[PDB]
Amino acid sequence: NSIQIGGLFPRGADQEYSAFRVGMVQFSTSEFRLTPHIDNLEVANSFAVTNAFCSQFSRGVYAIFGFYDKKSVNTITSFCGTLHVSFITPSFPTDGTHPFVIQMRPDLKGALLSLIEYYQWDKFAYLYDSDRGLSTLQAVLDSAAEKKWQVTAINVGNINNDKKDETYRSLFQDLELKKERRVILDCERDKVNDIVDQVITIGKHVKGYHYIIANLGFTDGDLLKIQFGGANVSGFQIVDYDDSLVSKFIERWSTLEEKEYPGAHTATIKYTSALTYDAVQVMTEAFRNLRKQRIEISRAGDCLANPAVPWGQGVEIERALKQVQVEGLSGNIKFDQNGKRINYTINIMELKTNGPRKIGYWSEVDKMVVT
């Protein structure tokens, strides 16, 4: 029989939805079938997200897989938590300890702070994207205070496409007056590519500059265009193309028909997409585990019912999700009691003239290791 689940996907998150579908095939099993109800929406719009959630709730889903952003995360956490509906997501982990949310994405803060120390930086620029949220900036500034770092923090959010190219050039001119050659980019893939383009245009991809790319997808970026100038470039990668699990997956993914699977037919997968595939494994494994434990699960009505009516089996589903431990595209997958990734590994990368090189890793049990 079927287990209905919700899928809340941002508009144009094609590669993620392809990875979701590939996961549904790869992890299908004799004990049950996952049957997804897909809403595509504007994830920054809390009204839209509330309508989709309530719509899924009324159809009677057993969990929801999805994405939120800084603006809608309080909607997801509050409704999931109230109604005991588990949310599984590759989005940025929440700031506190909200229940009924399973966070596929490992925390970056610990590794980033260790890497600053590893290179012995005590003076740097930090380019942050206010449209994406501010908790990594807050951590970095708190550490700066504790450790006496001098941080030049510059907002690269809220930039009209009109003058994006011109704004970045003036930002970097001002940095050269202060003679600042060490820069961290706390942005995701698109904005990183935009900034890198302007760094190259003004000739600051040359020897004597160091960029740390502060996201979990180092090689998701177009690195080849900054690979030959002479600047140092470092980053983080949670998908290891040398693991055999990942190369086996890439054999099939790279040969999928791009017309049927948008964003496939490539030798890399964005970490967001990889975590989505991994989410299908986590959800499958949770429901299989409920059967091994002979914990029976069948039975949602009005989203805005007064009083709030949360189903009894919600806690059981949550608990099974959070007890999963598997190997996926993102390494070992395990969760603490608040659904945060634990016991994970983040590979530390540096760009060289022959391609990105893995120099070590950061682990959630210890800290930075050179390999």
Using alpha carbons only, give the angle 186, 191, 195 rounded to the nearest 5 degrees: 90
Quote the least distance from Cβ 268 to other proteins, whole Å: 33
Q: Which is nearer to other proteins, 185 or 290 (CB)?
A: 185
Cβ-contact 196, 226 below 8 angstroms = yes
By CB under 8 A, is residue 332 in contact with other proteins? no
CB of 187 to other proteins, least distance (A): 16
Nearer to ligand NAG, 37 or 181 (CB): 181
Residues that bind ligand NAG (CB under 6 A): 181-182, 208-210, 232, 332, 334, 343
Does 228 participate in binding other proteins (rule CB under 8 A)? no
Does residue 300 bind other proteins (CB under 8 A)?
no
Q: State the distance between the two ends of the chain, measured CA to CA, in whole angstroms.
A: 47
Minimal distance, residue 167 CB to ligand NAG, in Å: 23
- Closer CB to ligand NAG, residue 147 or residue 252? 147
Give the C-alpha separation, 21 to 251, whole Å: 16
DSSP string for residues in 83-134 = HT--EEE-SPPPSS--TTEEE-SPP-HHHHHHHHHHTT-SEEEEEE-TTT-S
Site for other proteins in 13-72 (CB under 8 A): 45-48, 50-51, 54-55, 71-72
Q: What CA dihedral angle connects 330, 335, 336 and 338, to 10 degrees? A: 100
Amino acid (1-letter code) at residue 115:
L
Q: How far apart are CA 67 and CA 8, in angstroms?
A: 6
How far apart are alpha carbons 205 and 211 in whole angstroms? 9
- Work out whether 304 is an interface residue with other proteins (CB under 8 A): yes
Binding mask 260-299 for other proteins (x = CB under 8 A): ----------------------------------------
In the complex, least distance from residue 54 CB atom to ligand NAG, rounded to whole angstroms:
37
Contacts (CB under 8 A) with other proteins, residues 81-110: 81-83
Rounded to whole angstroms, the Cα distance separating 172 from 180 reads: 9
User: Which residues, including other chains, have CB under 8 Å from residue 145's CB and lie 6 or more apart?
Assistant: none
Can residue 170 be called a binding residue for other proteins (CB under 8 A)? no
Positions in the binding site for other proteins (CB under 8 A): 45-48, 50-51, 54-55, 71-72, 74-75, 77-79, 81-83, 130, 134, 138, 141-142, 144-145, 150, 152-155, 174, 178, 303-304, 306, 308
